[PDB]
Amino acid sequence: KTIIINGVQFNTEDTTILKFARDNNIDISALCFLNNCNNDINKCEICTVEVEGTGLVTACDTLIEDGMIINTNSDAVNEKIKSRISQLLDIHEFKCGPCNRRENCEFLKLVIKYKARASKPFLPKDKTEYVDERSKSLTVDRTKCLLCGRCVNACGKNTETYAMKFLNKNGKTIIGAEDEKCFDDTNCLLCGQCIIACPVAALSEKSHMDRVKNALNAPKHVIVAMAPSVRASIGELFNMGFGVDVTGKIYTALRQLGFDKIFDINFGADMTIMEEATELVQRIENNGPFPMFTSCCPGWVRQAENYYPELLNNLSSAKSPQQIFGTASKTYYPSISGLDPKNVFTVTVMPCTSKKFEADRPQMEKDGLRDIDAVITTRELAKMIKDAKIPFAKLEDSEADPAMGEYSGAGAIFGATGGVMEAALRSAKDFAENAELEDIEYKQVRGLNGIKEAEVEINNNKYNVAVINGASNLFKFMKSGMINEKQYHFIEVMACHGGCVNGGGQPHVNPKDLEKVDIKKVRASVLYNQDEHLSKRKSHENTALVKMYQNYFGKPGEGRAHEILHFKYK
Ligand code: 402
Ligand code: SF4
Ligand code: SF4
Ligand code: SF4
Ligand code: SF4
Ligand code: FES
Numbered sequence: 001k002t003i004i005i006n007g008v009q010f011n012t013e014d015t016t017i018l019k020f021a022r023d024n025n026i027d028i029s030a031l032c033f034l035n036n037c038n039n040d041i042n043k044c045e046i047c048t049v050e051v052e053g054t055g056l057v058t059a060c061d062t063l064i065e066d067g068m069i070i071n072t073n074s075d076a077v078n079e080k081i082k083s084r085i086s087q088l089l090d091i092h093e094f095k096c097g098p099c100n101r102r103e104n105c106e107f108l109k110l111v112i113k114y115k116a117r118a119s120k121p122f123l124p125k126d127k128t129e130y131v132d133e134r135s136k137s138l139t140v141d142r143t144k145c146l147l148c149g150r151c152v153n154a155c156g157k158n159t160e161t162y163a164m165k166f167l168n169k170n171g172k173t174i175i176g177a178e179d180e181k182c183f184d185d186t187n188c189l190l191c192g193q194c195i196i197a198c199p200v201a202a203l204s205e206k207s208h209m210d211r212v213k214n215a216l217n218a219p220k221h222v223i224v225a226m227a228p229s230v231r232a233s234i235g236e237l238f239n240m241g242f243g244v245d246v247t248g249k250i251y252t253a254l255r256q257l258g259f260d261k262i263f264d265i266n267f268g269a270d271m272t273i274m275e276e277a278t279e280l281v282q283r284i285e286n287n288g289p290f291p292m293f294t295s296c297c298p299g300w301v302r303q304a305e306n307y308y309p310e311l312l313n314n315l316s317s318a319k320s321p322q323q324i325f326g327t328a329s330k331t332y333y334p335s336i337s338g339l340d341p342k343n344v345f346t347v348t349v350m351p352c353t354s355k356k357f358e359a360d361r362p363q364m365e366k367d368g369l370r371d372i373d374a375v376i377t378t379r380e381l382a383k384m385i386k387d388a389k390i391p392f393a394k395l396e397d398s399e400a401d402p403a404m405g406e407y408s409g410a411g412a413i414f415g416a417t418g419g420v421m422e423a424a425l426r427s428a429k430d431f432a433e434n435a436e437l438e439d440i441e442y443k444q445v446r447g448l449n450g451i452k453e454a455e456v457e458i459n460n461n462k463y464n465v466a467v468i469n470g471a472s473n474l475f476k477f478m479k480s481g482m483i484n485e486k487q488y489h490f491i492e493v494m495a496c497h498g499g500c501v502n503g504g505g506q507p508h509v510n511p512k513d514l515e516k517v518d519i520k521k522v523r524a525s526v527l528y529n530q531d532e533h534l535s536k537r538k539s540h541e542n543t544a545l546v547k548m549y550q551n552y553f554g555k556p557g558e559g560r561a562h563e564i565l566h567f568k569y570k
Contacts, residue, residue, distance in 0.1 A: 001066040006073065017059035017070060018047055022515060028072050029081065029110060032148040033060035034197055034511055035157050039149035046110065048080050056080055082114040089118035092200075093127075093143035099201050100383070103237075104508055106199035107146065134182040136360050137190040137206050137353040142174060145202040151175060154197035158497060159471040161303075163188035175202075184357065187306040189471055191299040191495045192353035192504015205353045205505055209384065211374035215345040216258050222345045223329055224254050225263040225404070227322075228415030229351040229500045230378050232526030236507040237382040238392045243522040245529070248397025253385050255398065261333075264400050265348060266407030268325030269414040269423065272296060273539035274549065275318035275565055277427035278557035280490055284432060284458065289314060291466075291488040294420050295567075296320040298354035299495025303471055305569065308478065317566040319371075321414065322348050322355055323364055324565050326371030328404065331564065332552045336403060341367075347374045349381045351415070351503035354495070366564060377505030406544040409531030416524035417469040417499035418445035418452060421492040425456060425465070426538045432459040440537055446528075448498065448520055451477055463489040470497035498524065 003010050005026055013020060021028045032044040038060050047059040052069040056077065071077065089111065096102045110116070122143070124130060130142040152175060155164035163186055167176050177183045183190065195203040215222045231247040240246065251262050276294070283292055295301060295315040304311050319327060329346045333339065348355065358364070359372035376384070385392050400406070410423035422442040430437055444454040445465065450473040453466045464486050468474045474493055477483055496502045498520030509519055536542055553561045 001064060001068075003064050003066070004069045006071060013064065015064060017049055017051075017057075017062050017064055020064050021059065021072065022512070026072060028059050029113065030060055030511065031106065031110065031146070031199060032150065034150045035153055037153050037157075039147075039153075042147065042149070044146075044148060045084050046081055048077050048084075050074050050077050078114065082116050085110055085114050085116035086118060088146050089116060089122070090120055091122055092118075092146070093122055093124055094118070099144075100204055100379075101144075101201040101508075104510070105201070106510070132176070132182070133206065135184050135190070135206055136357040138183050138188075138192065138195065139204045139206050140176065141202055141204065144200045145175060146200060147173060147175070148199060149175075150197040150199065151194035151203055154193050157472065158193040159189055159191065159303075159495070160475045161187050161189060161306075161471070164194045189299040189302045189306075189495050190354040190357045190504075191471065193496065195353065195504050196502075196506065196508065198508075205377045205380065206356055207380065208356060208374040208376050209380055212347055212376060212384070215347070215373065218345075220345045221260045221339050221343055222258075222347060223261045223263055223333070223404075224259040224347045224349065225265045225268070225325060226250060226254075226349040226381075227265045227351055227355075227500065228269065228412060228419075228527055229503065229506070229523065230349050230381070232415065232501060232523045233351065233506055234378050234382055235393075236509070237379070238385075240393055242513075242517050242519065243525055245526045246392075247530075248399070249392055249395040251398040251400055252395045253390050253392055256390050256395075257384060257388060259347070261404075262398075262400050263325070263329070263404040264407055265321050265325055265350075266411040266414065267404050267542070267545065268321035268328075269411030269420075270408050270539035270542045270545050271324045271328065271565065272318050272321045272420075273410060273423050273427050274545065274556040275324070275561065276316045277424050277431055277539070279316055279318060280424065280428045281432045282557065284461075284463070284489075291483075291491045292316055294492045295569075296414075296420060297494050297496075297500075298352070298358040299471060300474070300493040301358075301569065302354065303474060303493075303495065307475075312569045315569060317568050319565055319567050320358065321411075322350065322375070323358065323371045323567065325404065326359070326364075327366065327564055328548070328553075330366070330369045330371065332548055333404060335552055341369055344369075345373045346371070347376065348372055349378065350375050351378050351500045351506045352496075353377065353504040355505075364567070378507060379505060382507070402544050403548075404544065406542050407534075408539050408542045408545075409534035409537035410539045411542070412530040412534060413527045415500040415527050416446070417448070417494055417497075418442075418467045418492065419499060419527065421445045421465060421467050421490070423539060424490070424492075427540050429456070429458050430538065430540070445492075450497070451482065465489060466491045468493040469499070471495040472497075501527070 031046040032039040235244040413419035501523035
């Protein structure tokens with residue numbers, strides 16, 4: 001094909017004008033196009049271009065054709081785009097100062113680019129009609145919503161629940177949950193993939209910043225611990241680029257924020273493995289029940305509760321790393337510090353919105369003490385650091401407090417799809433064989449395929465394992481009958497494609513950057529690199545963890561560990 005774009009000739013592909021332009025350093029804007037789909041109904045038309053002889057077309061869904069002459073920047077094109085943006089301003093409370101997307105908003109960028117102006121500024125006097133903060137995990141601010149459909153499409157594609165809907169409310173279109181219910185009261189997973197898809201501040205996480213501020217100000221001993229994924233991602237929000245390991249800077253920043261103890265959820269990950277690998281070995285000895293499923297992803301737990309309740313008894317009884325850590329923080333940690341358990345306030349930093357729901361489940365407490373008092377997302381921590389004027393990108397490295405802060409390489413990889421599986425197999429196989437095996441890499445469970453399997457030899461018998469990478473793939477695995485091609489023994493499920501590194505609490509990424517950078521792979525690489533360089537690569541070799549079990553919990557899977565570190569869903 002010979003195509004002319006802005007008077008420059010190209011000889012080439014069967015692709016859209018937008019993709020060809022993005023591949024050839026030609027500027028075309030876009031808004032509603034994401035995840036390979038636009039808002040098929042009510043298209044934004046921000047990607048308008050002129051095709052000579054045809055007229056104005058949407059570049060995001062128009063294929064190039066031999067002989068095409070395209071102009072991306074004529075007066076007629078720019079006036080059309082400007083008009084569409086102006087119409088969006090008419091429904092948009094354009095008040096960026098206090099907005100939680102001020103630094104990385106796709107809409108502000110477009111307003112500036114086209115010098116767009118509302119025909120009538122939208123100045124709602126009462127936000128309460130527009131705001132839904134009922135959920136434990138998600139919030140909606142419809143004063144910001146462009147009705148671009150990105151969230152609806154992302155929910156459908158990533159989860160297949162269609163829990164995010166277009167709704168007709170009083171003759172007007174909104175997005176929201178089924179019947180405009182609180183999300184939590186629907187089949188929604190609370191995974192936040194809708195948030196990640198949103199170009200503006202319309203969808204957000206339910207804030208826990210109040211909880212944290214108040215605890216830090218209460219003369220309370222405030223512990224903080226971050227998830228695996230945070231250290232592979234938060235630097236994105238400090239202009240550091242992608243794939244940067246910022247672990248040591250985070251520890252320094254958390255001390256500067258005034259936390260009293262700097263621990264790490266990866267220590268909790270090693271605890272989960274102690275319990276869960278022990279359980280797997282028991283199920284092997286007992287001839288089942290099989291399969292055992294992981295229980296550490298709250299989004300998956302809700303998927304099982306909402307769609308597959310017959311599987312709940314097959315979930316591992318080990319608490320998630322977050323909850324198992326929290327339980328220990330109110331029991332073990334007082335025993336080594338002298339703190340009154342009631343005065344410990346435990347904060348986690350997570351790449352996840354569904355972790356807020358998990359932490360707030362009524363039974364996730366003992367003796368009146370919550371396992372976890374507050375959960376802030378990666379985004380919330382970045383805001384806290386910025387509000388404190390901490391110069392994150394140039395901080396010196398520090399280390400965690402060791403007693404609940406050391407982690408093995410097995411715990412380090414939890415945030416990638418297949419990480420829990422690999423970590424668990426490293427311990428299970430030693431436990432079942434009563435041996436110290438040098439070969440610990442399970443590359444067959446790694447990477448971005450939607451469903452992954454492997455056959456593993458454990459103590460001279462073959463077992464089948466599966467890794468389900470994303471909620472939509474759980475539905476595929478079940479509905480297709482794949483779960484029945486063989487007897488599966490152990491199955492990891494993550495709700496977010498890529499695992500937690502791509503969770504709903506993570507930094508937003510510009511659609512153009514997503515096309516240039518494989519965010520799932522690049523964030524995960526930080527974690528696998530840590531494992532490669534850690535002196536301990538098995539959870540049961542974490543020295544601080546060994547001390548905690550030796551001194552306090554006893555043997556995994558029994559005694560005090562069974563009594564308090566487990567949770568079953570009825
Ligand atoms: N709890 C817990 Fe997990 C651990 O460790 C996180 O913190 Fe995850 C991450 N990153 C999240 O959110 S949850 C699911 N399993 C994989 S990783
Ligand atoms: S969503 Fe974007 S354009 Fe709207 S107020 Fe927030 S930062 Fe400004
Ligand atoms: S939290 Fe997840 S399941 Fe719920 S609407 Fe958003 S994308 Fe869909
Ligand atoms: S909530 Fe966000 S992604 Fe969903 S339609 Fe509104 S602006 Fe678009
Ligand atoms: S995969 Fe990770 S970030 Fe996503 S819902 Fe599950 S625990 Fe949360
Ligand atoms: S980006 Fe093409 S119609 Fe919205």
